[PDB]
Amino acid sequence: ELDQLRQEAEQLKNQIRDARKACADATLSQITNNIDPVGRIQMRTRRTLRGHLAKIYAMHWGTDSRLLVSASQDGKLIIWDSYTTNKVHAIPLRSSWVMTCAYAPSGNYVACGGLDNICSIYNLKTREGNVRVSRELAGHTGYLSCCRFLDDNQIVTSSGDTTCALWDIETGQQTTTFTGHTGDVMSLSLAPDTRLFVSGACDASAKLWDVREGMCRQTFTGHESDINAICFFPNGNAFATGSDDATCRLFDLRADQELMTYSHDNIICGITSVSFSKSGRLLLAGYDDFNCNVWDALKADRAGVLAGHDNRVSCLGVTDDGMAVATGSWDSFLKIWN
């Protein structure tokens, strides 16, 4: 009874693989060969936001394209002002071990979490001059690896217990639970319309999730090693991921298969973060050799490099209007490139 179910599942995955092979008629490079490439891209460090004492594990831009958050193992959650390098805030974290930060699309809340298995929500628009811990979210049995606001009243967070969970910041309890991963979920990425979201895990699989339905829709397996970074395409119909295999891969939500691979022989370090440009032509990816390669999202040619950090580049984010790229790092110095 069990063995026959195993054979049925194997036959089903074979059917899926042959369907994906039948849908593949031409390669993306074969189509995009006739496009003229981008010239050499040289970005310059405009700002340098210093003030963190320990390594920086996560940053996040604000929707107003001006303010950004940073979290570090020194226990400080600083809310900078990238224009005039002006520390608008510095929130003292209850737990020094944090691995993620989020910044609400309204600018009113900030979230943080990590090895303490809790996603605290820090208010910002208080009447008095203070930032009180509004509501702590504790329903996970593993460290939180990522979080992303939907509204200023709902947050979807992944964790190291293999399950993502959509919360209700007003109540404090899970409204849904997204399970189906084998390894633990390392990163997620919200869709532009905030109805879908992808998630990567250490079982080398990226799954597309439906928010309102709570069910999985599709799954992708091209990578060998763990998946650390994931980011949607600006139009919400594709995404790139990052892995410890030193390659990034572009997947598609319609063709249901990998479209292109981003590898180079001089690269054997694991991708730590990925992000797209404003039009999706550039694919930024921060590595472990302390560099930040800027790929050509349609040609797979290494356009330019941003070598300005002395330690591993942990976080990376393109501005919501496409102006600048802020790459945090473990030597505690964020840098704005443009």
């Binding site: 340098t48 210093r50 002395d310 030597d331 110095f333």
Partner: protein, 265 residues
């Protein structure tokens, strides 16, 4: 003409030391500009300040030897005052580096003082200032002839002047060298004692790593001390200029290679 030989050899050795210390200063500027987090480290600041003090001492010695016995009296009065100032600066910087070693390997915990390098630099550049102000308040500088057993002028310099009493010279050069050497040796002895006491409490008696590091540090520091002792206390006559120039060249090269290996991964 022994003057020719002495001048040329002292100049050549001094110049080689100058070249290497200038390499060190340039490399420090390059490292401070091209790398963050290098502005908060204080050991490279002490090292580069000692290197610069030796550089300026070499420059002053070159100016003195090149233009000796020429010019007015009150002119190289100030020249010799400057040369004495830079000698005492080199000594005080060796002393301050010994004190920094004391903070790193004797009192290991809670060694944070605000404006650390400010206070160190204030001491190391303003104690010889008081020394020179005092020494000059008594009009002790002037010409200083070197005879070399023949009563012939083997080299005209205008170091401390000969007035039948050399209390100033001995109290403010030899005495300063001895006080600084004593401070250095006391700090090295405290370091050795602390290491060889910890080698018993951690139960790792022989295998301990510091039991070798500290012996090497002692074997180098005592050499650096005794070579300057030999430089000062022996008179700069003929057949001993070569050794002095060689000691100076090596004192430059060691600083340069130490700074370029310690701070270039």
């Amino acid at each position: 003409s022994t003057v020719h030989i002495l001048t040329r050899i002292s100049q050549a050795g001094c110049g080689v030391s100058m070249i290497f210390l200038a390499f060190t200063i340039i490399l420090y500027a390059f490292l401070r500009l091209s790398r963050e987090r290098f502005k908060s480290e204080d050991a490279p600041k002490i090292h580069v300040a000692l290197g610069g003090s030796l550089f300026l001492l070499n420059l002053a010695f070159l100016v003195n030897v090149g233009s000796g016995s020429k010019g007015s009296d009150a002119a190289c009065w100030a020249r010799g005052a400057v040369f004495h100032y830079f000698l005492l600066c080199a000594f005080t910087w060796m002393g301050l580096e010994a004190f920094h070693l004391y903070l790193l390997a004797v009192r290991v915990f809670n060694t944070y003082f605000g404006h650390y390098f400010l206070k160190l630099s204030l001491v190391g550049w303003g104690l010889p200032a008081l020394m020179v102000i005092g020494t000059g308040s008594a009009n002790s500088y002037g010409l200083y002839t070197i005879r070399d057993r023949e009563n012939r002028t083997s080299l005209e310099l205008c170091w401390f002047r000969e007035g039948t009493t050399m209390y100033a010279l001995y109290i403010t050069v030899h005495g300063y060298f001895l006080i600084t050497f004593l401070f250095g040796m006391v700090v090295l002895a405290l370091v050795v004692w602390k290491i060889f006491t910890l080698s018993r409490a951690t139960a790792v008696k022989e295998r301990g790593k510091n039991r070798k590091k500290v012996l090497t540090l002692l074997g180098l520091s005592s050499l650096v001390g005794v070579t300057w002792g030999l430089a000062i206390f022996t008179p700069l006559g003929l057949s001993t200029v070569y050794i002095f120039a060689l000691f100076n060249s090596l004192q430059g090269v060691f600083i340069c290679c130490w700074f370029t290996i310690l701070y270039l991964p």
